[PDB]
Amino acid sequence: KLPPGWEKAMSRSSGRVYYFNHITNASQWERPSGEPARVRCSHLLVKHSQSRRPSSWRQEKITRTKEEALELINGYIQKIKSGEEDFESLASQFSDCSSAKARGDLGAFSRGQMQKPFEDASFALRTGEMSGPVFTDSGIHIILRTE
Ligand SMILES: CN1CCN(c2ccccc2CO)CC1
Numbered sequence: 001k002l003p004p005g006w007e008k009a010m011s012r013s014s015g016r017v018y019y020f021n022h023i024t025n026a027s028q029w030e031r032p033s034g035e036p037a038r039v040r041c042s043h044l045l046v047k048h049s050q051s052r053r054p055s056s057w058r059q060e061k062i063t064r065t066k067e068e069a070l071e072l073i074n075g076y077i078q079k080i081k082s083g084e085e086d087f088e089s090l091a092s093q094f095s096d097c098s099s100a101k102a103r104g105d106l107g108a109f110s111r112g113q114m115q116k117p118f119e120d121a122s123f124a125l126r127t128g129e130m131s132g133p134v135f136t137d138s139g140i141h142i143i144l145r146t147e
């Protein structure tokens with residue numbers, strides 16, 4: 001029916017059908033368009049107090065809750081989708097990953113290298129697609145597949 005991970009859903013507030021991907025947590029009004037040895041991704045990570053290492057170049061001690069991290073992620077996603085902000089700009093400024101210095105770029109990778117939820121979302125994204133919030137032991141990720 002639909003590409004890997006996609007399902008139809010019903011908007012509570014509008015009643016319009018939309019599409020949701022349960023691997024990437026992407027959601028969109030438009031019917032989804034649709035695996036390689038490698039993908040290239042950028043990401044914006046927001047850590048929280050239960051992250052594997054609650055510390056980053058932005059904050060020596062990361063004290064925000066997972067719920068607070070998710071709200072930050074949601075707000076970055078809204079600004080990226082509205083065009084108010086670019087993914088690369090937000091990642092450079094606010095990602096708790098050191099890859100912030102590279103506009104969030106992680107370079108290219110294969111299956112078996114990244115944390116599994118990150119890997120699964122990365123490989124379910126089409127080139128140029130962005131995920132919704134993806135949870136790993138590092139925190140909450142916005143993933144952009146660039147290659
Ligand atoms: C020593 N720390 C900074 C340099 N490290 C790095 C930088 C760029 C590419 C890959 C790596 C390591 O996988 C992260 C750890």
Ligand SMILES: CN1CCN(c2ccccc2CO)CC1
Pocket residue numbers: 097098099100101102105106107
């Ligand atoms: C686990 N990852 C190691 C390599 N990462 C990094 C850091 C700085 C510049 C570029 C990169 C990678 O493109 C950090 C996270």
